[PDB]
Write an enzyme that holds these catalytic residues in place. Structure first.
Site, mmCIF file in Angstrom:
data_model
loop_
_atom_site.group_PDB
_atom_site.id
_atom_site.type_symbol
_atom_site.label_atom_id
_atom_site.label_comp_id
_atom_site.label_asym_id
_atom_site.label_seq_id
_atom_site.Cartn_x
_atom_site.Cartn_y
_atom_site.Cartn_z
ATOM 1 N N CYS A 127 0.843 -1.197 0.000
ATOM 2 C CA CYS A 127 0.000 0.000 0.000
ATOM 3 C C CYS A 127 0.875 1.243 0.000
ATOM 4 O O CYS A 127 2.056 1.191 0.329
ATOM 5 C CB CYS A 127 -0.972 -0.064 1.198
ATOM 6 S SG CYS A 127 -2.065 1.366 1.386
ATOM 7 N N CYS B 132 -2.381 0.668 -3.620
ATOM 8 C CA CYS B 132 -1.976 2.063 -3.507
ATOM 9 C C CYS B 132 -3.168 2.975 -3.799
ATOM 10 O O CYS B 132 -3.319 4.009 -3.147
ATOM 11 C CB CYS B 132 -0.825 2.334 -4.483
ATOM 12 S SG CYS B 132 0.625 1.324 -4.049
#
Length: 131
Positions: free
Chosen positions: A8, A80
């Protein structure tokens, strides 16, 4: 066995929950590790959402991508958001996806529950490919 990775923008939320589900769902046939493009503290409300499913994240910690190597991971799940991606070898493993998800960092319980469900479902889908 296949090695799964979750990456992430901050690790703390999207990846951390995904790791908690992935080890519960597949610890014994997959090995999981979460990371982030950059690290941040594992988020506290995340614990509560996983506790709804009957799992925990308090007992584990966050970790940067920099501490590992893509070659060990069969499957890489970025999360992300906005289709942000990873320049390095993490994008060139056997499986790659970017799970667009409403990064629970500082959000409402409804956002947390939505992402926690979406994540869990997607971990189950990812396992189903590799199983």
């Amino acid at each position: 066995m296949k090695k799964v990775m979750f990456v992430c923008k901050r690790n703390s939320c999207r990846s951390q929950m995904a790791e908690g589900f992935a080890k519960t769902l597949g610890a014994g046939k997959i090995a999981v590790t979460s990371c982030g493009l950059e690290s941040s503290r594992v988020h506290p409300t995340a614990i509560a959402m996983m506790e709804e499913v009957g799992i925990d994240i308090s007992g584990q910690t966050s970790d940067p991508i920099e501490n590992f190597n893509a070659d060990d991971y069969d499957v890489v799940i970025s999360l992300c958001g906005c289709g942000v991606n990873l320049p390095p070898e993490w994008v060139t493993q056997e499986i790659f996806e970017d799970w667009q998800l409403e990064d629970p960092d500082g959000q409402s319980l409804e956002v947390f529950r939505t992402v926690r469900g979406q994540v869990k479902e997607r971990v189950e889908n990812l396992i189903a490919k590799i199983s």
